[model samples]
Target chain A: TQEYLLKEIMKLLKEQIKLLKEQIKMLKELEKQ
Target chain B: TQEYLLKEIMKLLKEQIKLLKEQIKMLKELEKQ
Candidate 1:
């Protein structure tokens, strides 16, 4: 159960980071205007 | 810069997972009804 939790958490973490990065990109684009 | 990014990402990732776990707990409680 611990291993499964770790695996699932890591997966979501990567995806969440990806989402944060995309938001950062959007912020940068807004700043450029 | 890469190191800082990794550190920040990991921190936010942990927080996000914590939030997810809380939501899961809520779901389990709701299902118990």
Candidate 2:
């Protein structure tokens, strides 16, 4: 099922990107003067 | 410095997130259809 696989992979990618977005926020905090 | 390094990294990160976001949206739409 392409759709099922697509759904599964998308879910995984979403979580990783979610972490990356949060990482950006943390970087800003660390660099703030 | 971490500041300048973060500066460019955040920019690329922002664009990657945006790119992947639209890609996820596309897949979601395809799966729903």
Candidate 3:
């Protein structure tokens, strides 16, 4: 159960990082505008 | 125009930081389990 939970948490961490990266990209585009 | 753009950008930055904080909180919770 802990292993499964860890896997799920890792998946969420990846998703959060991707979302944060997208926000950073958007910020860069805004900076150019 | 630049002023308006800056205001918008700051709003988005705040939102991004808030999201990141939420993820960090979730990670802490997961760690406790």
Candidate 4:
């Protein structure tokens, strides 16, 4: 169903955005070296 | 229409994956520094 697929996509989209933020943060700390 | 929304969904889905690829590549370049 498109509705179910859409729901899953939103979940994944949120997860990916959060992961991107985390990696950016990690890079900042690493660069502090 | 289902046809219209279907294309848009696929387009956005691909766009999201494209950004994910770009972001991951950027991290690798930064890490190489």
Candidate 5:
């Protein structure tokens, strides 16, 4: 049974978003260089 | 979205179960009937 939307795809997507954010930060720094 | 069996994936072989079941149910239901 589905417990919560936040518990499933939302959680996986959130984790990916966090990693992507870190990558974006690095890319921005590289651009500034 | 809450579905029929499950989606934990690691919990079971979802595709095998679903495909086999569908072979019995969905095709057998035959709209042409």
Candidate 6:
């Protein structure tokens, strides 16, 4: 059960990181224009 | 055996959007009140 929680948290963090990357790309494009 | 469940899971896996939109709204409302 504890392992499952840890894995789920890691998965959520990875997803957040991916979302942040996309947001960063948009922000960079906004800066360029 | 079910492709619909796969699509549903992807659609419902919007925790980041839910958290950001809901949480931010609540926080702003709290600050206003």
Q: Candidate 1, A26: how far from true, in Å? A: 34
Q: Is candidate 1 or candidate 2 better by lDDT?
A: 1
Clashing pairs in 4: none
**lDDT string, candidate 3, A1-33, tens digits:** 655655555566556667887765565455455
Error of 2 at B31 (Å): 43
**Model 4, total clashes:** 0
Best by lDDT: 4
Per model, the share of native interface contacts recovered reads 0.11, 0.00, 0.06, 0.08, 0.08, 0.03
Ranking by DockQ: 4, 1, 6, 5, 3, 2
Q: Which candidate is the best by TM-score?
A: 4
- State interface RMSD in Å for all models: 12.8, 18.1, 19.1, 3.1, 17.8, 10.5
Residue pairs in steric clash, candidate 1?
none
Per-residue CA lDDT of candidate 2, range B1-33, in tens?
445544545665576778667666555555665
**C-alpha local distance difference test of each model:** 0.62, 0.60, 0.60, 0.73, 0.49, 0.56
Better of 2 and 6 by DockQ: 6
Worst 10 residues of 6 chain B by lDDT: B1-10
Task: Report the lDDT tens digits of candidate 3 across residue range B1-33.
Answer: 455545555666566677777656655555665
Off by over 4 Å in 3: A1-33
TM-score for each prediction? 0.49, 0.47, 0.51, 0.54, 0.42, 0.51
Better of 1 and 5 by TM-score: 1
Candidate 3 docking quality: incorrect, acceptable, medium or high: incorrect
- Candidate 5 lDDT over residue span B1-33, tens digit each: 344434654234434444445544443344324
Model 6: residue A19 alpha-carbon error in angstroms? 0.6
**Two-way lDDT contest, 4 vs 5, winner:** 4
Candidate with more favorable, higher TM-score: 4 or 6: 4
- Error in Å for residue B33 of model 3: 0.9
* Candidate 4 lDDT, B3-27, residue by residue in tens: 5686577678768767876777787
The list of candidate 2 runs beyond 4 A from truth reads B1-33
In model 3, which residue pairs have backbone atoms overlapping below 3 Å? Answer: none
* RMSD each, Å: 13.7, 19.2, 20.2, 2.9, 18.0, 10.9
